[PDB]
A paper describes a structure:
Canonical prokaryotic type I [name]-Cas adaptive immune systems contain a multicomponent effector complex called Cascade, which degrades large stretches of DNA via Cas3 helicase-nuclease activity. Recently, a highly precise subtype I-F1 [name]-Cas system ([name]-Cascade) was found that lacks Cas3, the absence of which is compensated for by the insertion of an [name] endonuclease domain in the [name] Cascade component. Here, we describe the cryo-EM structure of [name] [name]-Cascade ([name]) in complex with target DNA and characterize its mechanism of action.
The head part is capped by [name] binding to the [name] 3′-hairpin region. The trunk runs along the [name] spacer region supported by six [name] molecules ([name].1–7.6). Starting from the PAM-proximal region, an 18-nt [name] base-pairing with [name] and a 2-nt [name] are observed in the density map, while the remaining DNA part of a putative R-loop and the cleavage sites-containing DNA duplex are disordered. The C-terminal [name] domain of [name] is located between the head and tail parts and is clearly observed in Map A, the head-focused refinement map, but not in Map B, the overall refinement map. The PAM-containing DNA duplex is surrounded by a positively charged vise consisting of the [name] N-terminal domain, [name] thumb, and [name].6 fingers. The N2 of the dG(−2) nucleotide in the target strand is recognized by Asp82Cas8, explaining the second C preference in the 5′-NCN-3′ PAM. The [name] [name], consisting of an anti-parallel β-sheet (β1–2) and surrounding three ɑ-helices (ɑ1–3), folds into a canonical ββɑ-metal structural motif with the conserved functional residues His304Cas8, Asn318Cas8, and His327Cas8. The apical part of the [name], especially ɑ1, ɑ3, and β1–2, has extensive contacts with the ɑ-helix (ɑ2) in the C-terminal RNA-binding domain of [name], while the [name] side and base are supported by the [name].1 web and [name].6 palm.
Residue numbers in the entry:
A (entry chain G): 1 to 340
B (entry chain A): 11 to 335
C (entry chain H): 3 to 255
D (entry chain B): 11 to 334
The structure:
DNA sequence: GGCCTTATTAAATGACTTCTCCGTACGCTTGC
DNA sequence: GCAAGCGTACGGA
């Protein structure tokens, strides 16, 4: 089995040279790769070099919060700066005849793996030692591409650099694949982009599942909610109606038009009180200013051509000023039509 | 002297634009009447007509091909598309959200003050206002309309309706009085004579009854639905904010080949313009080389190159030193 | 002391993606916004300080659509030129991201000598220059002082739920979250803060070369929603900063 | 110079067409009177009449078969169907939606200008106007109508109506005055001598009282309702814009086998007719090889191949070439 | 206060588009 | 003469 898998990946070269090529690239690549749990290149592939951390801690299992210390991630991640050193991550992930990983068989130094590898190379002891003694990835620098965030401490500010976590991303993406929780799949990374993050787990987990932390469903925006916050205006213009002057209805004869405009706009557009426009004194004042009044003239009242309860906006374009008796007549007609 | 750029120069975008809703109306009632415009699902059966190698072609050529799609159409009763969108302008100097070298920060502030003395920001502000006046933000929706009106509202003052169809998209107009006034307001905002400015734009396009309308596509990746998905904004059709902004950023006619390419392009660090397969500013004219020459070498660049550099500062972006291991 | 409400703010394209979570931004995003507002006010010599924040949701829309299977699919903007070795090419790499639009009202808990309508007008003139979680503030109804829980307009506050998380089935903390969410459908996970992955120091490349620095992992927890008509103590929704020897935490006290 | 067709090349639809809305009417009153025509849900008890292998057949042959459906039928008072839809013609030269090589853009503009010199767009425009006059867009609704009257309106000028029964679908008429007057405006629009042209048409089909009407059926993708769903536009029945545009595109009589079939096919990249399952232009005269021969090889193609090429540019499409 | 019907059946044949979304050392070539 | 810019394999659940 294993020799066929090794052969199957190594290009199209004749048999003996292609196996030796794979072992040569493997042995060269081991020193370039590191053991880690956080990977700066996961948020942005352009940050140069290895930046990441290997969090050993386990204490916080009932502190009321989740992190890579107090969640049981099972698989250690392996990371490189460059995809052309990535081969050991594939080599280690191969399954032997028992279906267990080369990692397990290496940790056991199992006689099966020793026999398999010694039939292909004498370097097996050094390959095993290198793989098992990979250094931990240590942060040593920062870049424009890492997310850098100020956090207040006692009126001073610390400068946090946020590293994403790959062990948790793999673990959560696994466990949500097998649970009913509301979840979203991110499907954005290409295979090439995922490879250049240089992680093993990110190459396995290029399209992760993640928690859908959204408000209650009734608070989703919809057209019904949106139309409830857009307001009606009348179609007539009080600056052009013969029988209106200085914003005041001067002719009685137009009253059926104002009534009909209110009816025609109002039908079915009821707004409950908490959603209605507030009648604002600023609007009435600006209306009076447009026509040069200091105050509402004696015996007149300012009316909304479309009632505010039936969708009308509190705006100059919706106001008209009526005499008290005409105001009463229009109010009575609208109350009769809308069943107030 | 300044050796090199700082490790973390970053500029926030100075000319912010919001998502636009579409509404539909009848042109003669447009001032008072509006109805929602809905994105409608429209699944489609195709023939297979894409370019195929001949050994595959003879197997595939006659097959039918279903495809999912979405499309947007005015009602049979309305005839005019309506767009409403907002803009917010912020001062250039105060938008520099980070810089890790106080010497460089001093130098860049000094050069911006020099530019405010040379121009304020009026020439750029004119070109941005002209791209509002051109109704270039309509993109494909401009390709045919009987009448177009653009109404610009600044802090509840309403300016007169531009007949936006009268402008040639290749030519910027210096002398329209309303463009000049709004451009002065914007230039005052960029120079820091005000801390902010809100501009609300309404635009009306009289297309015709039941004619098609083009909101921007979403970009989404899904296993099944490769079909066209349009941008629903609060259930009504809308335009992505970035596409309107990219319409406004088409001020640039200063790139070196311009005598052979008489059209303007989007302001970009290397003059990359997605309609043409080659960046218009590789090498010596690219933004990095110009700003380095202006600040590290203190050369007095010609005014066109200051226009371009300051236009990229208005664009905003991430401008650090080339990072190292 | 006093309480200022920023009423029904509309946010476009808030940064919705965290390493484990898509949706509601990190709590630190909102509290950092409040701190930025404090710094802006203080630079004008208004001398206000803002000790805590209450977050009330009114509407949301995740940038995306629902599959027929009900799951959301997240939208991206087409990326522009990204700095680094390949920046010249017209096509640029697509990284993990998601964006959400929010309609939200912010309660602020305030210290100041002149907490009044003038400092509300100063907030009004200040807030136009800021962002929320990288999102753009399109509009807001009003800024006002408030005195009682009857003043807040109807909406839903977001509050911490450490009790439900600790009381969950005890196999593992991620299993505690999973079992809690599978038992209590109204609760949601949230990013709460940061854990130091390395001791405080200075390193090359800092945003600022002169403020002390840490590498950190995001801390997550479980939270839940409470109607503002059902709140009893105003303090039950005021998120505040806390620090503990290498934990950087938002919390309610 | 030009090594190959660009990385990206897209042409916008030049003959933009609306959805079509159905109405019902009585033919004598038709200028004054219209009612909505609705789509009625149905469900239907079929028989298992499909072809079955014998081991299945002898077990199920007699079983009933209930099925979901929808249908559209005129009222018991009206007797004519009415179709309203619009067209919006755009310039062909300004239709090129994307490119990746300014040399290629210059070359294609040069070839369109050369075509506008060799000919108008008139010879295509007359065929599109013929397919309006032919009432091909009726599709199944054309079968067994008593009289068909098509009315073309261009910005509040109404042209004299077409007696669409009189046109043999296999022939395109060159000398009808009304067809030529409409086609001149379309040709002026395609050449870029005008910025746009909105054409609205009203088509009256006298079917018979209470008779069935055939809107376009909806596509479904293993949806839980597998049964026939019909297209509703603004609640009344309608036709997809795609199906009307396809009817109008049936102008092509330049494919090589034409003298053995003598009927026009839809303008298509390979000339894949759907009513007959053999493609009429694979290989040597497929669109890709003709446009590449016209531009990359700069060869002066015969005028009928230029007609076909320009008809595909009118259709619009994606022609991007992958670069090795 | 009692109850909400028993059988039979859920089709066939074809199709699910093409394009872009990769960082890097390694060393060879051009510019200062 | 010395350092910056560019074409290219390299690698992979």
């Amino acid at each position: 089995l294993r020799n066929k898998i090794l052969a199957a990946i190594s290009q199209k070269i004749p048999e003996e040279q292609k196996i030796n090529k794979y072992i040569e690239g493997l042995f060269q690549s081991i020193d370039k790769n590191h053991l880690a749990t956080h990977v700066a290149k996961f948020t942005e592939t352009n940050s140069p070099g290895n930046i990441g951390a290997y969090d050993i801690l386990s204490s916080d299992m009932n502190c009321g919060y989740l992190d890579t210390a107090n969640a049981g991630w099972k698989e250690p991640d392996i990371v490189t700066n460059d995809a052309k050193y990535k081969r050991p991550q594939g080599f280690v992930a191969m399954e032997m005849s028992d279906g267990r990983t080369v990692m397990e068989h290496l940790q056991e130094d199992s006689a099966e793996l020793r026999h398999e590898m010694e039939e292909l190379t004498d370097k097996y002891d050094e390959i095993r030692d290198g793989i098992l003694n990979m250094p931990s990835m240590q942060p040593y620098r920062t870049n424009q591409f890492i997310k850098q965030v100020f956090f207040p401490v006692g009126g001073s500010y610390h400068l946090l650099s946020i590293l994403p976590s790959t062990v948790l991303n793999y673990e959560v993406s696994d466990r949500l694949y097998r649970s009913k929780i509301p979840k979203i799949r991110l499907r954005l990374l290409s295979s090439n982009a995922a490879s250049t993050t240089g992680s093993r787990l990110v190459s396995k987990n290029k399209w992760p599942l993640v928690f859908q932390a959204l408000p209650p469903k009734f608070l989703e925006k919809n057209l019904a909610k949106a139309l409830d916050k857009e307001y009606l205006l009348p179609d007539i213009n009080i600056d052009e109606l013969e029988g209106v002057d200085n914003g005041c209805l001067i002719d009685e004869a137009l009253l059926p038009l104002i009534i009909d405009e209110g009816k025609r706009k109002g039908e079915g557009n009821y707004r409950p009180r908490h959603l209605r426009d507030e009648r604002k004194e600023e609007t009435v004042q600006a209306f009076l200013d447009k026509y040069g009044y200091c105050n509402i003239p004696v015996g007149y009242e300012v009316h909304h051509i479309v009632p505010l309860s039936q969708g009308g906006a509190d705006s100059i374009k919706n106001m008209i000023m009526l005499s008290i008796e005409h105001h009463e007549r229009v109010t009575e007609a609208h109350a009769s039509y809308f069943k107030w | 002297t300044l050796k090199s750029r700082p490790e973390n120069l970053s500029f926030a975008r100075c000319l912010n634009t919001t998502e636009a809703k579409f509404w539909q109306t009848d042109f003669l009632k447009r001032h008072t009447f509006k109805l929602p415009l809905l994105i409608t699902d429209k699944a489609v059966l195709a023939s297979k007509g894409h370019e195929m190698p001949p050994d595959k072609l003879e197997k595939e050529i006659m097959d039918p091909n279903p495809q999912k799609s979405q499309s947007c159409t005015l009602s049979t009763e309305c005839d005019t598309l309506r767009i409403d969108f907002g803009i917010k302008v912020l001062p250039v100097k105060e938008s520099m959200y980070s810089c890790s070298d106080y010497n460089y920060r001093t130098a860049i502030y000094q050069k911006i003050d020099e530019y405010i003395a040379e121009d304020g920001f009026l020439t750029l502000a004119k070109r941005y206002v002209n791209n509002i006046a051109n109704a270039r933000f309509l993109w494909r929706n401009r390709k045919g309309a009987e009448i177009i009106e653009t109404i610009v509202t600044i802090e509840d003052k309403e300016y007169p309706s531009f007949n936006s169809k009268s402008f040639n998209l290749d030519t910027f107009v210096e002398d329209n009085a309303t463009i000049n006034e709004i451009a002065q307001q914007i230039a005052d905002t960029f120079a820091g004579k005000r801390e902010y400015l809100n501009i609300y734009v309404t635009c009306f396009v009289k297309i015709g009854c039941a004619m098609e309308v083009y909101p921007s596509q979403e970009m989404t990746f899904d296993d099944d639905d490769k079909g066209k998905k349009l941008f629903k904004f609060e259930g009504s059709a809308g335009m992505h904010s970035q596409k309107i902004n990219n319409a406004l950023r088409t001020i640039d006619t200063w790139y070196p080949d311009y005598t052979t390419y008489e059209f303007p392009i989007p302001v970009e660090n290397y003059g990359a313009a997605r309609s043409i397969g080659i960046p218009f500013r590789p090498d010596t004219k690219s933004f990095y080389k110009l700003i380095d020459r202006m600040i590290l070498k203190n050369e007095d660049l010609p005014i066109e190159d200051k226009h371009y550099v300051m236009a990229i500062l208005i664009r905003g972006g991430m401008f650090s030193k080339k990072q190292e291991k | 002391k006093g309480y200022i409400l920023l009423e029904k703010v509309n946010i476009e394209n808030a940064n919705a993606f965290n390493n484990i979570i898509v949706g509601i931004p990190a709590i630190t995003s909102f509290l950092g916004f409040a701190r930025a507002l404090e710094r802006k006010l203080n630079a004008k010599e208004i001398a206000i300080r803002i000790n805590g924040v209450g977050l009330e949701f009114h509407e949301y829309e995740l940038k995306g659509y629902k599959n027929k299977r009900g799951q959301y699919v997240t939208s991206c903007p087409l990326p522009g030129s990204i700095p680094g070795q390949n920046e010249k090419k017209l096509d640029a790499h697509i990284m993990n991201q998601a964006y959400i639009d929010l309609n939200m009202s912010f309660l602020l808990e305030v210290e100041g000598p002149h907490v009044d309508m003038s400092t509300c007008k100063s907030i009004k003139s200040t807030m136009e220059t800021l962002r929320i979680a990288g999102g753009i503030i399109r509009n807001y109804k009003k800024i006002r002082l408030i005195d009682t829980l009857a003043d807040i307009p109807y909406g839903y506050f977001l509050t911490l739920r450490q009790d439900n998380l600790n009381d969950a089935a005890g196999d593992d903390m991620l299993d505690k979250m999973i079992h809690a969410l599978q038992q209590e459908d109204t609760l949601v996970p949230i990013a709460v803060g940061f854990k130091a992955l390395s001791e405080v120091g200075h390193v090359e490349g800092q945003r600022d070369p002169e403020k002390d620095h840490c590498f950190v992992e995001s801390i997550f927890s479980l939270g839940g929603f409470e109607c503002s008509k059902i709140l009893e103590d105003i303090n039950s929704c005021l998120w505040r900063y806390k620090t503990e020897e290498g934990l950087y935490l938002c919390t309610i006290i």
